[PDB]
Amino acid sequence: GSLDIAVYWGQSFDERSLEATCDSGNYAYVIIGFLNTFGGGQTPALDISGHSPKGLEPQIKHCQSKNVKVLLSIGGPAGPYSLDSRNDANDLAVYLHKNFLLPPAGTSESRPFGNAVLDGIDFHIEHGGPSQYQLLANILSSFRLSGSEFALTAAPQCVYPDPNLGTVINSATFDAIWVQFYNNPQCSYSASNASALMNAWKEWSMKARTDKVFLGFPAHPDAAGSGYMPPTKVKFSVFPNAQDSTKFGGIMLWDSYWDTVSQFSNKILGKGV
């Protein structure tokens, strides 16, 4: 009844399985990344590091049976995704809704993850935006109000306001955001000094129009170019001030593959290493 951890999954063919990731008991959210191809005349495509999309169906259900929420992340660190036209936004919204956020209907749906129904969509938009991402969020949010309830989340970089997602975050549409306090020395843990990190956190927690702000950290030094902060340091230096915010959601970890190696979340939670 204390720390919620969101974790990205799908980043390595050889990673701990989705079902085993959920079985750790360490995570409140598992975020499958990524639908990294869409927009500009492209057909939608997943890059989930060679994992079988249809094979995820029972694993997603297992996760959900363990009261882990499972999201699909759109965009990702890189990839041929864009959302320049209003039609692109409509198309992506409908595709996501029909294939991932509703039970199957008819026979024409591609159902990448089979008959699984996901708990929401994560906006990990790292280039291009703000584009038509506001319209995409508007249409998905409309669906949130007209059928199955699901979450909308975002993964901005740590400079407030985010260049790709800042305007969409300002609409208050996201249930939660996890800020990437890494690959960005100006707003991350750096030179063994947390001042810039804590200044950035203060701003995000004050200004981000969302009920829950999570702090995103790398799970291992190799998981990001910069910004790794050891788990004892996060507990000691970040948590007392972060917990003073009514918006404190917990932490997000990049990513399950590396967390399996490092046992970062085990250390955060005080579970045996």
Numbering used by the authors: 1 to 273
From the paper:
The XAIP-II and XAIP are two forms of a protein that possess two independent interaction sites and inhibits two structurally unrelated enzymes xylanase GH11 and α- amylase GH13. The polypeptide chain of XAIP-II adopts the triosephosphate isomerase (TIM) barrel folding with an eight stranded β-sheet that forms an inner circle while the nine α-helices constitute the outer loop. Because of the presence of an additional α-helix α8' (residues, 255-261) this protein is grouped in the subclass of family 18C proteins (GH18C) of the glycosyl hydrolases (GH 18) family. Hevamine also belongs to glycosyl hydrolase (GH) family 18C and has the characteristic combination of residues Asp125, Glu127 and Tyr183 for chitinase activity whereas the corresponding residues in XAIP-II are His124, Glu126 and Tyr182 indicating a loss of chitinase activity.
We have determined the structure of a new form of xylanase GH11 and α-amylase GH13 inhibitor protein (XAIP-II) at 1.2Ǻ resolution. The two forms, XAIP-II and XAIP show a sequence homology of 87% while 13% sequence variations occur mostly in the regions of ligand binding sites. As seen from Figures 2A and 2B, the dissociation phase is slower in the case of α-amylase than that of xylanase indicating a stronger interaction between XAIP-II and α-amylase GH13 (3.4 × 10-8 M) than that of XAIP-II and xylanase GH11 (4.2 × 10-6 M) as estimated using BIA evaluation software. On the other hand, the presence of inwardly protruding Pro77 in the middle of the inner β-barrel blocks the channel passage right in the middle just before the positions of active site residues. As far as the differences between the impaired carbohydrate channels of XAIP-II and XAIP is concerned, the most notable variation is observed in the proximity of chitin binding site where Ala78 in XAIP-II has replaced Lys78 of XAIP. The loop α3-β4 is considerably rigid in XAIP-II due to several intra loop interactions and hence lacks the freedom of getting induced fitting upon the binding of xylanase GH11. The insertion of an extra residue alanine at position 105 in the α3-β4 loop and replacements of His106 by Thr107 and Asn98 by Lys98 reduced both structural and chemical complementarities in XAIP-II with respect to the binding site in xylanase GH11 resulting in the formation of a less number of interactions with xylanase GH11.
